[PDB]
Write a structure and sequence with these properties.
The PDB classes it as chaperone. By secondary structure, this protein is of the alpha+beta class. It has one domain (3-138). Helices cover 25% and strands 19% of the residues. The relative contact order is 0.30.
Amino acid sequence: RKKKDIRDYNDADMARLLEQWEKDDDIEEGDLPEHKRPSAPIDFSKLDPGKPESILKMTKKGKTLMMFVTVSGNPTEKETEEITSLWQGSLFNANYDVQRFIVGSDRAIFMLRDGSYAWEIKDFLVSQDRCAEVTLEGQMYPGKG
C-alpha cells in the first residue's frame, strides 16, 4: 500500500464510495457547520498569473478542498463524486494535494489545496483512527483565480 496510491491524479477520491460497503455507521456525525469561503489567490508557493484569455475562457471552476475522515462505514457515494470536482481547485493552488489509504474495513481520506501544510495536522488527524468531517464550498471562486 501507499498513502500516495493515486491513479496518476484522476478520480481515485471517488474510491471512497467503497466505504459504503461497510455501512457499520461507526459514527453518527458527518456534516459540520460550514459557510462561504474567502475569495483570493491561494497557492503553496506562487501561482502562474498572466495567463492567456484562451485558457481562462476555456473553463473556470474555483473551489476550496478540505475533508478529513477515518472510520468504517461511509454511505455517501454521491458526495464522493463531488470530491473530484474540488480536486481541480487544488491545481491552481499547487498541483493536486490529495492522499488516499485503505486498510481493514475502514478507509481514510485527506484532501487539501496546500497539502504539505496539512501534512502537519494530518499526523494527529489520521492518528485518531476515528474522524468524520467534510468541508466543500465554492463562493466567489474560493481559491482558483
